[PDB]
Amino acid sequence: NVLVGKSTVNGKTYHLGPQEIDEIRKLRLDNPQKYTRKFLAAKYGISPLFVSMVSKPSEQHVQIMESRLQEIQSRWKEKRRIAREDRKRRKLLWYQA
RNA sequence: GUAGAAUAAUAGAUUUGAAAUAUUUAUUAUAUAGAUUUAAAGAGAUAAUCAUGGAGUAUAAUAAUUAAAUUU
Ligand SMILES: [Mg+2]
């Protein structure tokens, strides 16, 4: 098996109720850095992806993240940017078939 | 210029399915292994630009008069 999720190896679970979900959402809304997706997953025996699907974090956090990303991008050299672009192009190509 | 219909894009509202091949789908770091790749100080070729040079080309008092031809 190559690059497969844990849910495929051991079947999907629908154990988590509505109240729990609500709680999770609330937590996400409250403190994203303390209650990050990974942490949530650990808590409720469930995928980070699932958590993400369930619950949007505070938009401020998202904005901050975006800013950070931008900063990182800026910090790049010329060559690296070009390389990144090339990679992106390659990725795009590799869904054509 | 105004009004109404057909289609496209963008935004909003209301629904929507889903634990979504997230031990990488999108993207960011660092490490350890490997593997490679990217020069232009100058140059070649081709083209163009600015020259140099003066081959080639036209002309040989360009007036006046004579005759013819062509337009007013
Ligand atoms: Mg080069």
UniProtKB/Swiss-Prot annotation:
S-S bridge residues: none
Compartments, record wording: Mitochondrion
Keywords: Mitochondrion, Ribonucleoprotein, Ribosomal protein, Transit peptide
GO biological process, one term: mitochondrial translation
GO cellular component, one term: mitochondrion
Other information: Present with 350 molecules/cell in log phase SD medium.
The protein's assembly and partners: Component of the mitochondrial large ribosomal subunit (mt-LSU). Mature yeast 74S mitochondrial ribosomes consist of a small (37S) and a large (54S) subunit. The 37S small subunit contains a 15S ribosomal RNA (15S mt-rRNA) and 34 different proteins. The 54S large subunit contains a 21S rRNA (21S mt-rRNA) and 46 different proteins.
Family: Belongs to the mitochondrion-specific ribosomal protein mL58 family.
Job description of the protein: Component of the mitochondrial ribosome (mitoribosome), a dedicated translation machinery responsible for the synthesis of mitochondrial genome-encoded proteins, including at least some of the essential transmembrane subunits of the mitochondrial respiratory chain. The mitoribosomes are attached to the mitochondrial inner membrane and translation products are cotranslationally integrated into the membrane.
Protein name (database record): Large ribosomal subunit protein mL58
Native source organism of the sequence: Saccharomyces cerevisiae (strain ATCC 204508 / S288c) (Baker's yeast)
This protein's encoding gene: MRPL20
Portion of the parent chain present: 99 to 195 of 195
